[PDB]
Amino acid sequence: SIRSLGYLRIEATDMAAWREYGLKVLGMVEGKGAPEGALYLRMDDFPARLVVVPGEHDRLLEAGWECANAEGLQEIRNRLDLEGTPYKEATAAELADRRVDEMIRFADPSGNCLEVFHGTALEHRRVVSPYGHRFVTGEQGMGHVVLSTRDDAEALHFYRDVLGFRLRDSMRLPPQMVGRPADGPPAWLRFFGCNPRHHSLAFLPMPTSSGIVHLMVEVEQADDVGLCLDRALRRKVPMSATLGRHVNDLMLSFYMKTPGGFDIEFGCEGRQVDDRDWIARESTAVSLWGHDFTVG
Amino acid sequence: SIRSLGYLRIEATDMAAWREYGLKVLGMVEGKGAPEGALYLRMDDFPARLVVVPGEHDRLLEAGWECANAEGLQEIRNRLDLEGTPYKEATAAELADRRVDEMIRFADPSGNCLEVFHGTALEHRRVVSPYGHRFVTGEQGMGHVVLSTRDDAEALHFYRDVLGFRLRDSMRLPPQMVGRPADGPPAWLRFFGCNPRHHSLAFLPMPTSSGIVHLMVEVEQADDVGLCLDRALRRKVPMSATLGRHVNDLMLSFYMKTPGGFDIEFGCEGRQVDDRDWIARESTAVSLWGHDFTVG
Ligand SMILES: [Fe+2]
Ligand SMILES: [Fe+2]
């Protein structure tokens, strides 16, 4: 523990657009009990996976990371204490809002905020998408998120050495792409695992207005993906990449712009990894085929 | 009885375009022993599946239909004689050229030419696509071909009642689509099977320049399809339909224009049918998702 991506909390300038998009494009289900004009989007037994709160910005607020139990959370505390990373225990009100038994809050060096928790409540009535797809979560958690970092070496240190994620994959970026002179060194996009899902987390050393590069959610079948593409097309959702399969996690997916300005990857067939045999290597292409990121 | 589609012979106005497309887009392999300036494209142990001969038009010449043995071919002779359909035995030169033991030649009432044969020679050196895909033939044969017909009822009688194909699916057209009065009767696109492949043959009662609406070839995996689409886009092959999944045969495929001006559907995951269970019904949509023919 940490074992998986639990939830994502984001701020939004357009709550109506997010509601229509989560319901009619993503085919998520609305959760009950929210604020004060906030939106809970459900994919499974979790009370909420995507929480959208109204605000003046379109940005990531926090990612919530689930541990197996009190001991698995304490292990994260002990790592943080060894590094000297400041953290706070959740207030009574934060525990009640998130519906978790314990949680700590802290930030990585680039100052992306984390909530690490255990003992979430679940809701048990069947979550049924009107479009007939089922999301793939379980032991792989919510999906995976790719976030901006200020410094890839620093991110590698905090996520692997401090937090204990595994390095799953790495891809180099030419120095020009990251605002470095043509004469100096490439920078690194690194993918991190906490469970069999190839990656739950990755860091792009390039800035974004939201802090999010992409959020991937996974469904069981290619037909689920293709039907989703059709719904997005009908609703004039702006496209970011055509259908394709990734090299590193073998995900078959397309990418589309959300109302928050970052991409959602809507995929299937994500590769599962066993840490006992996985060899961390450098991948040299994004995709095996498709995924034309010029489409936007 | 006829067991599968064996080969397709077409005439072409641009042999160089076909050789490049066959090799670099379809990833078929060139056969040997082709006559003067003809092109043999191979998918498997057949000496050729797609035969392209020089000519003044881009047009279907004949479809070759494989039977299991001499008795299977005689059963077709018997059916033709019962109907009063004229047919000719292949000459010595024709048997040698097609590399078959026996073959009869005749046409349907719309004038489409059939060559029904048994005892093909095979070639045994491995056929290796440079792109790494394997075609799906075997008991399913070469693929399927959708052809023009002048009269759907007469085609239904000839293919089902006379030749013994099974009716596999039907799709209705608005009377006005076939230039009838808008309060006239619908016409019918009918799909015919001779093996587990959902259909080997279908008839659109609408005219085409070549006689061909589409030729489908099948590969093992979605990645093979996705890779082919990238090759085709790179080579500026005209797209006819986006990636999608058909309703009737569940083929996951895209459509593209060949050098002959007709479409090839390049697909995977074709549905298998058992005649003991199969119910012949009317489908009311082309696709579950995708297959936007508006791109062409
Ligand atoms: Fe992803
Ligand atoms: Fe087809």
Numbering used by the authors:
A (entry chain A), B (entry chain B): 2 to 297
Which text from the study accompanies this structure?
This pathway includes an iron-dependent extradiol dioxygenase, HsaC, that cleaves catechols. As in the aerobic bacterial degradation of other steroids, the core 4-ringed structure is degraded via opening of ring B with concomitant aromatization of ring A. The resulting phenolic metabolite is hydroxylated, yielding a catechol, 3,4-dihydroxy-9,10-seco-nandrost-1,3,5(10)-triene-9,17-dione (DHSA). The overall fold of HsaC is that of a two-domain type I extradiol dioxygenase, with the structure most closely resembling that of BphC (rmsd of 1.16 Å for the 275 common Cα atoms). The active site is located within the central cavity of the slightly larger C-terminal domain, with the catalytically essential mononuclear Fe2+ ligated by His145, His215 and Glu266.
Crystal structures of HsaC were obtained in its substrate-free form and in complex with DHSA at resolutions of 2.0 and 2.2 Å, respectively. Crystallographic four-fold symmetry of the two molecules in the asymmetric unit indicates the enzyme is octameric, like BphC. In the resting state enzyme, the coordination sphere is completed by two solvent molecules (wat1 and wat2) such that the metal ion's coordination geometry is square pyramidal. First, the loop-helix-loop segment comprising residues 172–190 in HsaC, which contributes to the external wall of the substrate-binding pocket, angles outwards and contains a 6-residue insertion with respect to BphC, increasing the opening of the substrate-binding pocket by up to 10 Å. Second, the distal portion of the substrate-binding pocket, which accommodates the non-catecholic portion of the substrate, is lined with fewer bulky residues in HsaC.
